Amino acid sequence: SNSITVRARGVNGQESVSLQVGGTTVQTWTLTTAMQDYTASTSLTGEIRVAFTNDATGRDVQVDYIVVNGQTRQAENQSVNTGVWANNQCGGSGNSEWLHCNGYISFGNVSLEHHHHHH
Ligand SMILES: [Ca+2]
């Protein structure tokens, strides 16, 4: 299986995040106010999303990174962010650690490629 560690925190500790792979929710966690590692494994290899799902007054999520099969993918390096509040809207910008609105940061497919190397 593929190992995925999500490192994230909630602003008030009520926040729920789901790890989704190829559209399938493989695990859900309630966050604490401290950056913490959360780990799951899956045979699925689709697009990895870290999704904030229970936005309410006072709730926001900050994602540091994920680790996929030993490889760190920084949240701020991800061009897809559908939750950050920027330019007066949800998902206003890529390359953010933040999910303010319900939405997700996409970290790409489990298996990536470069010059015929698969990682
Ligand atoms: Ca490989």
What is the resolution in angstroms?
Answer: 1.6
For tokens 């950050």, the residue is 84
| Ligand 1 centroid, distance to 104 Cα (angstroms) | 26
| Ligand 1 centroid, distance to 74 Cα (angstroms) | 20
| Ligand 1 centroid, distance to 97 Cα (angstroms) | 27
Q: What is the CATH number of the domain that holds 34?
A: 2.60.60.40
- Residues 110 and 2: their CA atoms lie apart, in Å, by 8
| Ligand 1 centroid, distance to 117 Cα (angstroms) | 6
Method: X-ray
Domain total in the chain: 1
| Ligand 1 centroid, distance to 53 Cα (angstroms) | 32
Q: How far apart are the first and last CA of the chain?
A: 14
Q: Give residues whose Cβ lies within 5 Å of ion ligand 1.
A: 118
Residue 101: strand, helix, or coil = coil
| Ligand 1 centroid, distance to 119 Cα (angstroms) | 4
DSSP per residue over 31-100, as a string?
--SS-EEEEEEES--SEEEEEE----TT--EEEEEEEETTEEEEGGG-SEESS-EETTEET--SS-SEE-
Residue 56: domain span: 1-119
